[PDB]
Swiss-Prot record, chains A, F:
GO cellular component annotations of the record: chloroplast; chloroplast thylakoid; chloroplast thylakoid membrane; cytosol; nucleus; thylakoid; thylakoid lumen
Regulation of its activity: Inhibited by phenylmethylsulfonyl fluoride and O-phenanthroline.
GO molecular function: identical protein binding; serine-type endopeptidase activity; serine-type peptidase activity
GO biological process: photosystem II repair; protein catabolic process; proteolysis
Enzyme class per UniProt: hydrolase
Induction: By heat shock.
Catalytic residue list: 63, 93, 172
Protein name: Protease Do-like 1, chloroplastic
Keywords: Chloroplast, Hydrolase, Membrane, Plastid, Protease, Serine protease, Stress response, Thylakoid, Transit peptide
Cleaved signal peptide residues: none
Region (Serine protease): 44-213
Membrane topology value: Peripheral membrane protein
UniProtKB/Swiss-Prot annotation, chains B, E:
Annotated gene: DEGP1
Induction behaviour: By heat shock.
GO biological process: photosystem II repair; protein catabolic process; proteolysis
Function description: Serine protease that is required at high temperature. May be involved in the degradation of damaged proteins. In vivo, can degrade beta-casein.
PDZ domain: residues covered: 218-315
Residues of the full protein shown: 109 to 436 of 439
Keyword Nucleotidyltransferase: no
Membrane topology: Peripheral membrane protein
Subcellular location per the Swiss-Prot or TrEMBL entry: Plastid, Chloroplast thylakoid membrane
Enzyme class: hydrolase
Record's keyword terms, sorted: Chloroplast, Hydrolase, Membrane, Plastid, Protease, Serine protease, Stress response, Thylakoid, Transit peptide
Name by which UniProt lists this protein: Protease Do-like 1, chloroplastic
Length: 328, 328, 326, 326, 328, 328
């Protein structure tokens, strides 16, 4: 060994201390034997995750787990285990797994704080892009409080972290650490016309992660509020000079339904009779989908939200009490 | 929660960013369009980019390709307030443009002006812009190369002295600042080399030394006056067949510097046969093998100069004097 | 400058001091003038490399040189020289060149050590991406001991260094240096759906390069041990369904054949007379080839190694002595 | 007209007389209004067919009907009717429909004979290519007894008539008539790299259609003999290298299993325990399936047929009795 | 060698061809272009097509899409002599055009004019043209269908009464004759339906009955006068969203027939909201479900006619009289 | 059987009488055994041919035979034979094969005459498109005396027959018969943007075929004259107002070489010194490649052709005696 400089030494260390907490995740799919006609389990995906606690809980992106007839997590030392799906939140693309492993081979990553992050501080991403086990890439926090389309549901994910640390396919589910060797986010997606890292990557912030992992380990589900309306996307509403959100449907069996919000119908000659248009929700104004989403993201089941609509050419105000989203 | 002590290196990048992001702006290129349903005149964004604040008088600098073809321009300040921007002037060849905003002198932080002539490969650089609409994104890198010549199809005419960096630069970054570790402007990010159209680690910035000169001239006279030889010539991969080792002058307007001086254009003998004209083979002693060489030479010239251009005419060369004049 | 930081100052110095050792390599092909139709030489591709010693030996990837009528290397001061091929190793994509030039123009690149590298340390890549003469990109060692498929032709390369320092077409053959300004690897390939840099580049370790250059300089080729076996790909060992490397042909001359390995055959009808199937080599369990290769990749010509095959519903152990390919 | 020629005059008459029997078939799917989001029915595809009898039975290709919420047939006079599916045979892409309409609006198409057809005779195709209501194209019988892969799903169709009368998407289900103005086949598919007509269209022979319509009308399905075997494709019987149809699974219930055919298996390790392999069925030599299929395609449920397999370096002959698929 | 006795059927097709090929011509569409080397004005073919001789006065008929955008036209007679052609006039809607040639009256064989109204499906047809430049190619087929309506993007406005044939028709055939077995003009080949852009057995011809009328009018007055309602309407797949069961009139110029009569255009209430206008639902009693229906209706109308158009306006229909005027 | 009409009966008959003369040809290529590592013969192409004589000679397109490690011809009754390549002419894409077969299973097609063909007479094509054995397609002669690019060499093939009888991949090498049940051409290519029959197909005329088959059976080669010059293609000569054919090279060892025609060279400064330009060849004028080709197509080895060139701005006349093209 040669004498390494301060800085690089700090990252060399940070990596050795934390790589043990990172794991490889395999999404095995069912395939047929061309002759045996029976089945064989065979990898259709690769991703990462980290150890959350001594009880064998593993965190990752839900999109990495989606559709796996079976999934196995490989730990640092290469010992591979079978994993049970503890639970998951599709909106924030967070998922929790559990494995039966000896507490000695489990390092839970030190949990940090994402609320105090500053653009410019250094970050460290560890994951498995292209199957390269426990790859380290470094960069900087490029941005904070970003909103990105979930695609895991389409619903927007608020408060996302942006980094220019190389993030490629296979990094999803792995950790983003700060200079303190602390977890600040889960690497989950990128913006790139090629599908290759283009220097713009996103991580779900640790703060929203920790809450979700708690709820997931306790109840195996996260309960989120709904208004009970299907609205028109910002696009197919563009050509109507529509200020806010056009409710297309408010099922009689949901919150806005029981609260009497009107849906969009048809003239009898076939013309469109616009349903209510949400222009504001208790205080905060709503000009499009993101605004609505963002605002409800702050509510909890049971809250009595006061929503303002633009009904037949005259304003309105309606109180709706948010109920949990129907299960399945 | 209290922030964690950051290392000195990263802490610096954090200061540089707090200090300069406010000087960065977002620019919107609007163009007139037909309303689909009421067939009226509508204003609609067709592209966006970056820029920075130059003086307390409201002068915004950006790339020309950003404001090009614009019907109307809006610049949005860091604090999200937006102003209408007037085109002070621009230099299509060096892809630089100045805009004027009527905003409060306190909402305007001129960017520290640096020096590009003494930069060294390996120096740390900082890019701030709006790649993919991501507001004031900070990406970090190093100076990868100096004195690069990139042929910007955004004029055609090549550009030289350009800075090369491996800080991530993506669509949306054009027009934003490139800072040195001292937090001073050293270039304006304008293009990249990429098969994908996305950052691949090879980005270019027009050097501050070139920009200072141009902004100065645009503010003071509304234009940049550049000399011309007054000829239209055959692009390289067009005469590469004939073995032409220079610029095959296609047209020397009798009205321009080269025509009034006697250069002979290409011509057909009515018999169909192509009787080519003068072939420039050097100007002020500098060899001219391709159109770029000619360009580079003129780059270093001033209007009113008496350049001596050599030409291969009818089996012998011969030097002719041409007096460069301003572009009309 | 306006007072550089210590860290950036170190980069500045490192580039300043080593860019002289890097070179530009232009691979010229023979073409035909389209009007006169006389033959002429024109560039087929370009890459980089670096100076190895005061004798004028230049190192780069073999894939930079493959299929080139003539080779020309341009030194940092723009002066060019015709280049002779001293030798090259296809399996490790390393090639040595020799140019005839002024000893005061050759700065041998300081040679480092790759066995001690640690993930996270700073690296420096110098090369000519996109024709961008002596570009410097910077990153960290992202992974060590990686195994990437023959970035030239076939056999897996072992011990590959992974880095997120921007590496692009044109960087092939150039040096990857550590913070001590020493050669730790040769930038040679990348993983990318775009074909350009996306953060994962690989470079062959200097330790491996040191050896091969040395050999090439002296014997103009490097001797490698061979088993004397031809086998089926990991994808053809699937449907048949078994862990191991199936022997498809053991030339009676090639060691494995001397020893008694049986090749695959076709019975009177047409079905498969399943020749041997290697499942272990003197210890290590083989099962695909990345294995058989990986392991065998550490033997020397001569090393009598025991190979565990399988044939009659029973396993067996044959003793084979390694020889070199001719 | 200005005095038509006898030949064109015959075409004119033939179309004039039979276009009444052709119909338009629109396949409607369930969709969602994008603003009101109530469900609605909208066209998924269209095809043609023809009237079979005064009861309102309509004949077309099953592939014209597959996956349709509701079926509507439009008669030559533009009047439409909802259609009920009477039955259909997937292997011969034939389907019967029944509509409720005026007997004075149904012209049963004169039914011809396909067994006597000769290459070179004139044919007449009527259908709705590209929505072109009752288009008439003309050509000759280009080939007889052709075998084209299941223009619906799987099994080869036999006895297919080939023609160069322009056949395009939309013609599927329509009649192909001979010069006697009689039904000789159902236009069902084409060979084309463009996806549109290039001169080789195929239509299932009326003899085959006559039978299936009849069956469907009565039992609402047609019974077919099955061997009770699952086998590998002609492309997986390649690498192993042997003429024959390899048995991959003989369900102990399915006749072949009752008889004692052994399926392919995997030995303790993972290699292939090569189950049986059919090389002949009571006479005809099988070797791919187009064969096994072709042959077996002429048996009736019950027909005890001897099948020649192969297992222990020797051939053997098992007696199997055909049953129908449930 | 002596020719072999041909069958009567084929012998006829051989006569029909000997007799008519001389009346067929080749047409060249030349356009002005920049000479690459001497940057001068050059004449250069950009497309070719077919046509036929109409009278001894040198009138050539062809499709309009063939001569469209032409800078200069040359027609080549069967005997390979070529003449410059002047545009007599054309009807963009029925894609028909007449040209005039100054050639010797003996080199001109007018084509026999037939009748298209009494054609029958199954009749034998003969097409002569220049597919892919193949001089006076003869292709044979049958009349496949009558009264077809094809929407020629070569105007947009649909065309009706069109003949469908399975005689091979390929690029290069446009503008050439379609003959019946009596050797008389019955249509002019103009388009085909094909995924490949090449004959797939579905070709269309504009019927002779429509052509006779148009050529006549073009020769006599240089133009075809067609009526207008004076409205610009919303294309179908544009309002299909609103449930509009007719033509949603977007604009009724106050200067035109529909405006002077009172039809109301679509409009936004400055509040952004899209307040749509009249929706035509029938004209002279004929239902109007889509733009084509309206087109077809007007097709059968004459200028100066007082058409009564029904409109869905503010919850009720109401018939309004409009007096059709000539196209400007 | 039903009573068939005159016409169809004639074709039914023609087909049964001649289908026996048609054969299927298989182009087997060498492929490896993934395990055996030895070789297997495996079809890479399919085409047709017909029996030329009782001695087992089979005719086909050369392009069908090109590159076959082995080729086998299947006769009517399905008996497949191994075939020896008697010889071939690449210019006219004609090839002759020989097989060892019992004279009783060999019907040589009746040879007709192509010189008297008339556009409009009926034709019958028999071949194997898409592997459909002995497919019959009928149509008409659409054109005569056409010139098409050989692609088998690029050299143009003169005097080609055009038919609208469906001709697809797999028809090459099969016969085109006239109503007399006589061979009038070999189906060999088509014009189609899809690769599927588009109604424009070509056959090499029987007259030129018969000569070539004779020479091929006698000497196994056809001897064709050459001028001994490589010229510039009509394209890369376009921009030079070049009237005729620009000779690029006239090797000193060939006819025009020994006769002293000049090649194109380079100025010494790199400019182009045009070699001779052929404007005429003994009588007939030459304006481009096709003209030259076409004209030499009429000469025989040994002919002393007088060629006119445009040398350095003054005309010329040079006698060249054509020599056989060097073998290989």
């Amino acid at each position: 060994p040669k004498k390494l400089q301060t800085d690089e030494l700090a990252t060399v260390r940070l990596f050795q201390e934390n790589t043990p907490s990172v794991v490889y995740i395999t999404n095995l799919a069912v395939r047929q034997d061309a002759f045996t006609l029976d089945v064989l389990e065979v990898p259709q995906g690769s991703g990462s995750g980290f150890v959350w606690d001594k009880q064998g809980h593993i965190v990752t992106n839900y999109h990495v787990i989606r559709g796996a007839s079976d999934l196995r997590v490989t730990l640092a030392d290469q010992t591979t285990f079978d994993a049970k799906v503890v639970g998951f939140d599709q909106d924030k693309d967070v998922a929790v797994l559990r494995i039966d492993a000896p507490k000695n081979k489990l390092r839970p990553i030190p949990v940090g704080v994402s609320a105090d992050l500053l653009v410019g501080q250094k970050v460290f991403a560890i994951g498995n892009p292209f199957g390269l086990d426990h790859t380290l890439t470094t960069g900087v926090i490029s941005g904070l409080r970003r909103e990105i389309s979930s695609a895991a549901t389409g619903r927007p994910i608020q408060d996302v972290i942006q980094t220019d640390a190389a993030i490629n396919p296979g990094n999803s589910g792995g950790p983003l650490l700060d200079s303190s060797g602390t977890l600040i986010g889960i690497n989950t997606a990128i913006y790139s016309p090629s599908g290759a890292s283009s220097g713009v990557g996103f991580s779900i912030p640790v703060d929203t992660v920790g809450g979700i992992v708690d709820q997931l380990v306790r109840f195996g589900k996260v309960t989120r509020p709904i208004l009970g309306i299907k609205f028109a996307p910002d696009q197919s509403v563009e050509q109507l000079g529509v200020s806010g959100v056009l409710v297309l449907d408010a099922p009689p069996s949901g919150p806005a339904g029981k609260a009497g919000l009107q849906s969009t119908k048809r003239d009898g000659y076939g013309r469109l009779v616009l349903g209510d248009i949400i222009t504001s929700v208790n205080g905060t104004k709503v000009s499009n989908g993101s605004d609505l989403y963002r605002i409800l993201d702050q509510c909890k089941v049971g809250d009595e939200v006061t929503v303002e609509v633009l009904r037949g050419d005259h304003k309105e105000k309606i109180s709706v009490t948010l109920e949990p989203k129907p299960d399945e």
